[PDB]
């Protein structure tokens, strides 16, 4: 499996991991005018999951199952145990981690659901190398008090970074500065709007690249920038792939 380990976690190795993850997710992608790959859709359940290994500073490893249709976590394995989100595709447990003691987490893989059960938001959850490391531990032992925030960390540092070069770069800055951060409005507005940007980009094919609705993306000075077309470098040089939305 594609893997990222605490023991070899530099800017260079992180960047390669995210680059490879994007490549794997975009196998068989479709392309529009914008040239931003659109993830596969209607994927048979048996081929719907990409497995990724993360190893922490105790040399313990978890394997996460990423749904290739939406680049979200469906489940993960720790040793001989696995854990499925309650909105994982219904048949997923027959396809992945079959040879393990399977458990259902009583919450969805969405930020809104994770934040409600954990009682903690992304804005208050630090990101960085040591939080990546600790999140893997908490998931490995499945400490229910820390499972939600551990997903907030790993979803953002792995999946959201794959979706957006801006977010990847935030993590890279963190590694190089040896400095934790919490996502601000820039990062959250990307995460919030990934599905809406996917819809507008694809829909814009019929309107000379103009969107049906404007999307507000914040910059690092907390100024909202209206993105109402494909002609914004903060979108088209940032968003690495899209959710399938339009025929």
């Amino acid at each position: 499996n594609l893997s990222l380990s605490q023991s070899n976690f530099s800017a260079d190795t992180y960047k390669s991991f995210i680059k490879n993850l994007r490549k794997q997710l975009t196998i068989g992608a479709s392309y529009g005018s914008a040239g931003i790959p659109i993830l596969k859709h209607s994927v048979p359940i048996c081929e719907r999951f990409l497995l990724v290994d993360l190893t922490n500073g105790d040399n313990e490893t978890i394997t996460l199952a990423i749904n290739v249709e939406d680049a979200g976590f469906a489940a993960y394995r720790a040793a001989d145990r696995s854990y499925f989100f309650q909105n994982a595709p219904p048949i997923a447990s027959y396809v992945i981690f079959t040879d393990t003691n399977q458990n259902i987490m009583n919450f969805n893989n969405t930020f809104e659901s994770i934040e409600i059960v954990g009682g903690t938001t992304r804005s208050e959850t630090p990101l960085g190398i040591m939080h990546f490391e600790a999140s893997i531990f908490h998931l490995f032992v499945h400490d229910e008090n820390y499972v939600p925030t551990s997903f907030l960390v790993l979803i953002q540092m792995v999946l959201e970074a794959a979706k957006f070069k801006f977010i990847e770069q935030k993590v890279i800055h963190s590694i190089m500065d040896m400095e934790d951060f919490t996502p601000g409005l820039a990062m959250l507005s990307l995460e919030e709007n990934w599905t809406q940007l996917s819809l507008q980009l694809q829909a814009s094919e019929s309107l000379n690249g103009v969107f049906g609705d404007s999307v507000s993306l914040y910059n690092s000075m907390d100024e909202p920038i209206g993105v109402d077309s494909m002609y914004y470098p903060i979108l088209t040089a940032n968003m690495a792939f899209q959710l399938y939305q339009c025929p």
Partner: protein, 261 residues
């Protein structure tokens, strides 16, 4: 999902020097010319896009006024274009008449300049941002070895240096005409070489040229489409302090860039 087929959207259009596409005097007569003008909220800068490939302001359609290059772009009665295929906008913001291939062009930078239909050479004066948000986007530009492009030698050269938050000369203003401008001197633009003998990318006074038109591609390159080449770190070595224009290749990582805003 009827959201896949938007029926229309009203937006602004900005280009050279961040000025907007404007129906001069808000005049509505057929043949009324369009100009550059400082961006505002007035109705004659509101362009409504429809799926018939029309672009409309004041209820009339943006259109070329001749088959040959050099004549004004105007607004005219939409019924006149009933059998016309309309405008096509490229992913890099070239606005082209589909039949004649003439593109929307600003031959000067000054307010009230008449916009014309001209042969496409991919100049910055032929690049446009369709969108309501018309301001330059302020950013760092990150490249090889996770370093930042920096304006050097009194804003005449450019190369990679270690990224330092708020170091003034590492900020760039991305304009609606596809220019990359020194953030604290917005009369100066990143430029491909004007000397045949050199491939070196430099900083020069903004002039609307092919040399100053840059497209941030989804594949992570900074492309000069008129010269069919991309920004590259000389010899993939940041310590040479040389950024050059090269044919796109996968050989090294020197052609990969990130916009960090």
């Amino acid at each position: 999902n009827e959201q896949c087929s938007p029926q229309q959207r009203t937006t602004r259009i900005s280009g050279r020097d961040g000025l907007c596409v404007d129906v001069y005097g808000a005049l509505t007569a057929d043949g009324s010319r369009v100009i550059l003008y400082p961006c505002g909220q007035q109705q004659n800068q509101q362009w409504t896009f429809y799926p018939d490939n029309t672009i409309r302001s004041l209820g009339k359609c943006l259109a070329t006024s001749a088959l040959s290059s050099g004549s004004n772009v105007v607004i005219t009665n939409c019924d006149y274009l009933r059998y016309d295929d309309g405008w096509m906008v490229s992913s890099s913001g070239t606005m082209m008449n589909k039949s004649s291939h003439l593109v929307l062009t600003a031959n000067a930078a000054t307010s009230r300049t008449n916009l014309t239909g001209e042969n496409n050479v991919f100049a910055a004066k032929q690049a446009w941002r369709i969108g309501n948000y018309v301001e330059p986007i302020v950013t760092t530009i990150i490249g090889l070895r996770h370093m930042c492009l920096e304006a050097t030698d009194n804003d005449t050269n450019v190369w990679l240096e270690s990224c330092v938050k708020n170091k003034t000369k590492q900020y760039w203003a991305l304009y609606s005409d596809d220019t990359i401008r020194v953030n604290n001197n917005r009369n100066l633009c990143v430029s491909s070489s004007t000397d045949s003998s050199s491939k070196l990318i430099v900083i020069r006074r903004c002039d609307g040229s092919i040399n100053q038109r840059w497209v941030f591609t989804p594949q992570g390159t900074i492309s000069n489409p008129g010269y069919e080449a991309v920004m590259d770190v000389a010899q993939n070595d940041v310590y040479l302090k040389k950024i050059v224009l090269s044919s796109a290749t996968d050989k090294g990582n020197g052609q990969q860039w990130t916009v960090f805003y």
